Amino acid sequence: GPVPAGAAGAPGHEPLLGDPFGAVLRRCLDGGGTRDLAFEVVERDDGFIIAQDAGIYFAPPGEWPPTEQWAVERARGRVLDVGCGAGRHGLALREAGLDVLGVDSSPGAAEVARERGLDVLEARFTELPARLPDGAGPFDTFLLLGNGTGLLGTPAQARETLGALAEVAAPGAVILGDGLDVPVPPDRAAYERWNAERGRPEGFVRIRLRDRLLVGEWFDYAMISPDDLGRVLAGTRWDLASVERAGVRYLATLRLRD
Amino acid sequence: GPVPAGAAGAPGHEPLLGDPFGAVLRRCLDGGGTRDLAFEVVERDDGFIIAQDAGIYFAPPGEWPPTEQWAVERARGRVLDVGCGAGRHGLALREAGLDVLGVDSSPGAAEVARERGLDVLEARFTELPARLPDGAGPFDTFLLLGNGTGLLGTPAQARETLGALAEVAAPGAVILGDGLDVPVPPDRAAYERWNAERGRPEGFVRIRLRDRLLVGEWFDYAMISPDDLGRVLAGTRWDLASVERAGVRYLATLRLRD
Numbered sequence: 001g002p003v004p005a006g007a008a009g010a011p012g013h014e015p016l017l018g019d020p021f022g023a024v025l026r027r028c029l030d031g032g033g034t035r036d037l038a039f040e041v042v043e044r045d046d047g048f049i050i051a052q053d054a055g056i057y058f059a060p061p062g063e064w065p066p067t068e069q070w071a072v073e074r075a076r077g078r079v080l081d082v083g084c085g086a087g088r089h090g091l092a093l094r095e096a097g098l099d100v101l102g103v104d105s106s107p108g109a110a111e112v113a114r115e116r117g118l119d120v121l122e123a124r125f126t127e128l129p130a131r132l133p134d135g136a137g138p139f140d141t142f143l144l145l146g147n148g149t150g151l152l153g154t155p156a157q158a159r160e161t162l163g164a165l166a167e168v169a170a171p172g173a174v175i176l177g178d179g180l181d182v183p184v185p186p187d188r189a190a191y192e193r194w195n196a197e198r199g200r201p202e203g204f205v206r207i208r209l210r211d212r213l214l215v216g217e218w219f220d221y222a223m224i225s226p227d228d229l230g231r232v233l234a235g236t237r238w239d240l241a242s243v244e245r246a247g248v249r250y251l252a253t254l255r256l257r258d
Numbered sequence: 259g260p261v262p263a264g265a266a267g268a269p270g271h272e273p274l275l276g277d278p279f280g281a282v283l284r285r286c287l288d289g290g291g292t293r294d295l296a297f298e299v300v301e302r303d304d305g306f307i308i309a310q311d312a313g314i315y316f317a318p319p320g321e322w323p324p325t326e327q328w329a330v331e332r333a334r335g336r337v338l339d340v341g342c343g344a345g346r347h348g349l350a351l352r353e354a355g356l357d358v359l360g361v362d363s364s365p366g367a368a369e370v371a372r373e374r375g376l377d378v379l380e381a382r383f384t385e386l387p388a389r390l391p392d393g394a395g396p397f398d399t400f401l402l403l404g405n406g407t408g409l410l411g412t413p414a415q416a417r418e419t420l421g422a423l424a425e426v427a428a429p430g431a432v433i434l435g436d437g438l439d440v441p442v443p444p445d446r447a448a449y450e451r452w453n454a455e456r457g458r459p460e461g462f463v464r465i466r467l468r469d470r471l472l473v474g475e476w477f478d479y480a481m482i483s484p485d486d487l488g489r490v491l492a493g494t495r496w497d498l499a500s501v502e503r504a505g506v507r508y509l510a511t512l513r514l515r516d
C-alpha cells in the first residue's frame with residue numbers, strides 16, 4: 001500500500017521555470033570546477049529523483065569514458081560541439097589547435113564555456129542554421145558526446161536536430177556520437193507501462209532539472225542502442241557508418257549522405 | 259513574470275513516502291563509502307532543491323567540523339549517539355573503546371550503521387524510554403551532532419525530545435550538541451514571511467528528503483543560536499553549561515539537573 005507524499009509548493013512559493021543547469025555549472029566553476037561543489041538534480045515526470053556531481057562537466061580528457069576520448073582524438077576540420085554544456089569536449093580540441101564552435105541553449109552554460117575559452121553560440125539545435133553567423137562553419141565534425149545520442153530525444157525530435165546539423169555540414173561531414181547499450185531493468189517496467197498508456201515511445205523518460213527554486217523545461221531522454229540509432233536515421237541525411245563499443249558504452253560514427 | 263513549473267506525479271506514478279535516507283546511505287556503503295557515489299537531495303516545502311554528497315556520513319574524524327571532533331574527543335561513559343545516521347560518530351567512539359549505542363528512526367540508516375560496526379536501536383527519540391532494552395543505558399553522554407540542536411525542531415518538539423533523553427540519562431549526564439549560530443539569512447526573507455503568514459516559528463524551514471520515487475516525511479530544521487537554545491532549555495531538566503565556538507558553528511554542553 002503506497003502512500004503518496006504530495007507535492008511541495010504553493011502560489012507565490014513554488015519552483016519557477018529558469019536555467020538550473022547554467023546556475024549549477026556557474027556555482028561549480030566559481031569554486032574551481034572540482035567535485036562536491038554543485039550537483040545536477042534530475043526529476044522524472046513521476047517524481048523520480050536522481051543527482052550527480054556537476055564536476056563531471058569540467059573534468060579533463062583523461063577522466064572521460066573511452067568513447068568520449070576516442071571521439072575527440074579523431075575529430076578533424078571545423079568542429080561543432082553540439083550541446084557543449086561547460087565545453088569540456090570542444091575545449092580539448094581548441095587546445096589541440098582545431099577550429100571549434102559550441103552550441104547550447106542554456107545561457108548559463110554558454111557563459112561558463114566561454115569563460116573556459118570556447119566560442120559558444122547560444123541557440124537551440126533547431127535554430128542553428130538561422131542563427132549561425134557568417135564565417136562560422138560549415139562543419140566537418142559534429143560532437144554529440146556525453147550520451148549525445150540519448151540527448152537527441154524521441155525519434156521526431158532526433159530527426160529535427162539531425163536535419164539542422166546537416167544544413168550546416170560540409171561535404172563528407174561526420175557526427176561522433178556516443179551512447180549506452182544497456183538492457184531495460186524491471187524498475188522502468190512500471191514507467192514503461194505508463195508510457196504505453198500515454199501513447200509515448202518506448203525506452204524514453206521525461207525529465208527536467210531542479211536547482212534552488214529554478215526548474216528546466218521537460219525534455220525526453222533515453223539510452224539508445226546502436227540498432228535503434230540506425231533506425232532513427234532511416235530517411236535522414238546520415239548513415240550509421242561504424243559502431244565501436246567500450247563495454248556498455250559505444251561510439252557511433254554517422255556519415256553525411258550529402 | 260516568472261512561469262511556475264508545475265508539479266510532477268500522477269496516481270500510481272508519483273513520489274511515495276518511504277526511507278530515502280536509508281536508500282542513499284545503503285547505495286553509498288555498497289560502493290565503498292567514498293564520495294561521488296550517492297547524493298542526499300533535500301526539498302523545502304516551497305520546492306527549493308539542494309543536494310550534497312552522501313560521503314560526508316562516512317567521512318573520517320579529521321574531515322568532521324571541529325565542533326563534532328571536540329564532542330567526540332570528550333565523550334565518556336555510556337554513550338548514546340542520538341540520530342546516528344550511518345554511525346560515523348559512534349563508530350569512532352567504539353574504536354576508542356567506549357560503550358556506544360546509536361539510535362535512529364530510519365531503518366536503512368540503522369542497517370547501514372550496524373553493518374559498519376555500531377549497535378543501533380531503531381526508534382524515534384520520544385520512543386527511547388519504551389524501546390530501550392534492559393541491558394542498555396543509563397547514558398552519561400548524549401551525542402547530538404550534525405547540527406543536532408537544529409534537529410530538535412520547534413520548542414515544543416525539542417522539549418519532548420529532551421524529556422525523553424532525560425528519562426534514560428545517568429545522574430550528571432551531559433548532552434554534547436552542536437549547532438549553527440547564523441543571523442537572519444537574507445536569502446530566506448521571503449520564506450520567513452511565509453512562516454509568518456502560516457503562523458510557524460521564525461527561523462525554521464520545512465524540508466524533506468527525495469531519492470528515486472521515495473520521499474521522507476516533512477520535518478522542521480533550523481540553525482538556532484546558543485541564546486535561543488538556552489531559552490528552549492527553560493523548564494527542562496537540562497542546563498546550558500558551556501558553549502564552544504568555531505566560527506558559525508558551536509558546541510553546547512547541556513548538563514542534567516540533579
Ligand SMILES: Nc1ncnc2c1ncn2[C@@H]1O[C@H](C[C@@H](N)CC[C@H](N)C(=O)O)[C@@H](O)[C@H]1O
Pocket residue numbers: 021057082083084085086087088089103104105106109123124125126145146147151
Ligand atoms: N534542444 C537543445 N538545443 C540546444 N542545446 C541543448 C538542447 N537540449 C539540450 N541542450 C544542452 O545540451 C547540454 C547537455 C548536457 N548533458 C551537457 C552535455 C555535454 N556535451 C557534456 O557532456 O559536457 C546542456 O547544456 C543543455 O543545455
Ligand SMILES: Nc1ncnc2c1ncn2[C@@H]1O[C@H](C[C@@H](N)CC[C@H](N)C(=O)O)[C@@H](O)[C@H]1O
Pocket residue numbers: 279315340341342343344345346361362363364367381382383384403404405409
Ligand atoms: N525523531 C527522530 N527520531 C529518531 N531519529 C531521527 C529523528 N529525526 C531524525 N532522525 C535521524 O537523524 C539523522 C539526521 C542526520 N542528518 C544526521 C546523522 C548523524 N547525526 C550525522 O551527523 O552523521 C537521520 O538519520 C534521521 O533518520
Ligand SMILES: [Cl-]
Pocket residue numbers: 045046265266267268
Ligand atoms: Cl505529469
Ligand SMILES: [Cl-]
Pocket residue numbers: 292293313
Ligand atoms: Cl573520497
Ligand SMILES: [Cl-]
Pocket residue numbers: 368369370372
Ligand atoms: Cl539491520
